[PDB]
């Protein structure tokens, strides 16, 4: 139950946590995201350039 | 404002440092008068000056 | 303004995707409920082959 929220940006959700240090009177925040990549078949893509 | 991001294998930022919040401004100021002045004498306007407008 | 029917087609496709995105899981539950209630073998789906 730490002050937390989700922010939206064109179909992407990000989690913001608000936390603080009581003794030093400093208020801090953090934005987080965790991705995951996969490559199904290497033979269905690549690089193309203009041939001479 | 612009920000930079950290990249960690498990999400540790305790060791590193955070972003700073530097604020900048653009200023605009006034220039100089654009003045144009003319003068002529009473007899000149009495005899010679016509179609002054 | 999209005079051609081609340009109106991808707008329709985008609208279909936008409509399909949120209302996806509720319809999954509805389909699962109907299948569970009526299909003769639908009460053990998800573990048909276990051994």
């Amino acid at each position: 139950s730490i002050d937390s929220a989700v922010a939206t940006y064109e179909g992407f959700s990000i989690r913001v946590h608000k936390y603080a240090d009581g003794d030093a009177n400093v208020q801090k925040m953090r934005f987080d995201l965790l991705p995951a990549y996969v490559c199904f078949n290497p033979h269905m893509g690549g690089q193309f350039f203009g041939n001479p | 404002h612009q920000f930079s991001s950290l990249r960690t294998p498990t999400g540790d930022i305790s060791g590193q440092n955070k972003n700073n919040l530097i604020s900048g401004k653009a200023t605009g100021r006034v220039g100089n008068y654009i003045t144009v002045a003319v003068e002529y004498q009473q007899l000149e306007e009495a005899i010679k000056l016509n179609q002054l407008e | 303004m999209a005079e051609t029917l081609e340009k109106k087609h991808e707008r329709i496709m985008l609208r279909f995707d936008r409509a399909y995105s949120p209302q996806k899981e509720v319809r999954e539950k509805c389909i699962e409920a109907t299948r569970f209630a009526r299909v003769p073998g639908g009460q053990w789906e998800g573990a048909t082959a276990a051994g």
Binding site: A5, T8, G11 | - | P22
Partner: protein
């Protein structure tokens, strides 16, 4: 551009897949204003009418 009001109320134990919403608010006020009333006093078919 599009900007939404912030409430930080929901997302409280709930997954998100719908990311195409913008929150817009209607705002009602009540005020005391000075207005000028006009009194039409035509005797025909009733006379007092403000």
């Amino acid at each position: 551009p599009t900007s939404l009001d912030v409430t930080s109320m929901t997302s409280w134990e709930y997954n998100w897949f719908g990311a195409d919403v913008i929150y817009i608010a209607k705002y009602y006020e009540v005020r005391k204003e000075s207005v000028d009333v006009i009194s039409y006093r035509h005797p025909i078919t009733g006379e007092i009418a403000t």
